[model samples]
Target: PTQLPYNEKWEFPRNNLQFGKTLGAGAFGKVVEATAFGLGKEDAVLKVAVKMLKSTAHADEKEALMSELKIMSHLGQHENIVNLLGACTHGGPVLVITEYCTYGDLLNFLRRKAEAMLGPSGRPLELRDLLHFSSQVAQGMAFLASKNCIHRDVAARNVLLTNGHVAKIGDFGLARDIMNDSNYIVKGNARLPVKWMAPESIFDSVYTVQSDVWSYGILLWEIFSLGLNPYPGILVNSKFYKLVKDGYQMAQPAFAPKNIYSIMQACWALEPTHRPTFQQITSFLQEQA
Candidate 1:
């Protein structure tokens, strides 16, 4: 296994961490609810989410995990960005400690909310609630854009929900720093979410802040549709890619207001340069609110 290259100051003793229930799992590893002792102060104890690398993970996987940590550390503190508390790398199965969201991923939460409102008596999420969530996500993306960071995967599942229904951007596994370049071209074969990606990203394998904005529009559709999969009838394959390249756009979600749908359409402009930036999206959402 490749050793994590994080500084010693960020490292934590593995023994001081106590793992609890599993929060979630993916190809990289599993995230578990955990308690950490002596995190900040010698006697301090804190509840956190620990992302553990899979035992069978290869060097590339380890590198990607380290890259996520670096990006989180660079993001620092933000109301809409997940907080990275500390990490443990001294022993096997490197662990990354981050702020835990009790309500879990936004997709599942929205799905549950939609399910609960199946009957007339149940309270359904209003347009205001949708705007609030979208605004927070846009704010987080704006912050990332300011830092020259591009989140390759920006979807409902990547956002986490906390108490009071606050949304925070999480899951930096597919994120990358743009450094001085305006865009990054993926050279080799890299798997990406076809439905959430922009046309350029899907056809040219190029990513930019503009591409992220496109994904944000799909996320908006997901929220307004109460977690419906983007492009419901379209299969996520070459045919779907061709359709998008030929100017296919999804119809407005059933519950989405006309104004909100217009904003989403702006984000899906054929040319990346024509799409609205996260800053513009944020301001627009604020005005709508």
Candidate 2:
């Protein structure tokens, strides 16, 4: 169980991928753009993104990194889940390749658009687009929840958009499979998103599908606030985690229509069981709302 699944077809020649500038980087190392050639016997060239582990990482870090690939391979494909193209593990650095979203991350995309749009988006965002993106994310999360995957970090920065405006879930560096341990059984020193985390997650290091449901509440906040950083000045509090334990949740966004805040509240319920599942979220966001 400690070894990662290896399929011959899933491997690519080390030289097939030519790395480009960094797309982004975190504790896991970095992901970069690449031009991949002769993929899937097509001999056709394609543009892709690659996730690489830092050469300096210790044994456990590499294990967790490869676990991400094993998890993605098992989840199969969904329109809103960023699809994996392949991996290059035979050489220099173990690289995981995936489909590239031209618009970058939703956080920057919203802020950049804020210049012209007077909100997080520029040129004016249609109400239609906002809810559409919201529903897409819910559907995607529902898919992951169904697969028993807990995405510890579910926020705007991890959401990506295709050039055609389709929002897809990406960045699984912190996700874990409940199938393996039931809860996040292993915990250690690592940077955490205190603002976006659940009360239980912050206080007890407990993670479950329900805790992920908790993070989605913050993700909803990120969306309605036009990608504003969670808890503007609250992280400065040394006891912010304690504040969450006391049921202190964020207020509704200024421009957020009345329909969505109800959903956020439901997702932020103090008891994890009180939080709605991702599937339940879609019904409210897509049908009732």
Candidate 3:
């Protein structure tokens, strides 16, 4: 029986891996920093992050976590996507390893540099920095769309930041259906990223890659806003959905350039087909960048 998508080549003995600090803990499992040995060449020690399913977690979560590995392994390589590096399934707990982003998630990185704007070593950012991040993310999503992978979940927090300030889309969850509604997520609950989702996804549970394109537009909003929550003062209920069904897109954030703002509007189109594809989104962004 195939418990994982990738074969034995991608698997590692639990003893060969060493887990370190816990970065996050939740729904399926916790993410942690880890080190690996003998990854291709002998003594080729490397740093990697692990999304581990706690042994105490429910069997269902284990199934979901393994599914993430399958989706991850199914994809081809691209720098903008969080490329899976390896896994540990022989012993201990199930662990999916991938590239470690030194600067952490894009949400925190964008907001942190702005508020704590002091350091001279690029601590404070230029708008171009934000544009570059957006471009990379769009590029990744474009590639994902080409692969027929609907990244039903796309948001700033789901993006990781490397030391070079590059963005990588991660945190895949075909297991999203296991979650309840798009309502705001609280601890110990599975809430989808409703704010970033397309109207159809919110209203009908439909998830096309174009739905992801809509979310990408929202993510552009987050990047320009320097990581503020979308629909700043709105509720996540039928009223909000009703509002969007009519004509209730958020006004452009102060920091968003007019052209970029227009793209956001295109993404929020009521008709999923009316929305731009990730391909178009990246094409426009690349030219702008």
lDDT of 3 by residue, 1-289 (tens): 2364556666876687787997766555678888888765475688888887665678787777777778777777899999888888776667888888998889888888777764444557888888899999989998888888887778887899987888999873431223443434432344677788787877677899888888888898999999888998777777877888786898898789999999999998988898887878788888888
- Candidate 1 per-residue lDDT over residues 84-188, each given as its tens digit: 889877676668889889888888889999888885563668889889999999998899999888888898888998878889998734222222212222334
Distance (Å) between predicted and true CA of 113, model 3? 1.1
Candidate 3, residue 41: Cα displacement in angstroms equals: 5.0
Task: Candidate 1: list runs displaced more than 4 Å.
Answer: 1-5, 41-44, 119-124, 172-189
True lDDT of residue 88, candidate 3: 82
Q: By the TM-score metric, which is better: model 2 or model 3?
A: 3
Q: Candidate 3: what lDDT?
A: 0.80
- lDDT for each of the candidates? 0.81, 0.76, 0.80
Error of 1 at 65 (Å): 1.2
TM-score of 2: 0.87
The 10-residue segment of model 1 with minimum total lDDT is 174-183
TM-score-sorted candidate list, best first: 3, 1, 2
| lDDT tens digits by residue: candidate 2, 1-289 | 3465756566888687787888776554777899998877677688888887776566787776677778778777898878878877676566788888998878778777765675443256666676777888888889998888787778777888887788888874622222242112223465566677888887788999889888888887888788787778654354766678888888998657876888888888999998887887888778743
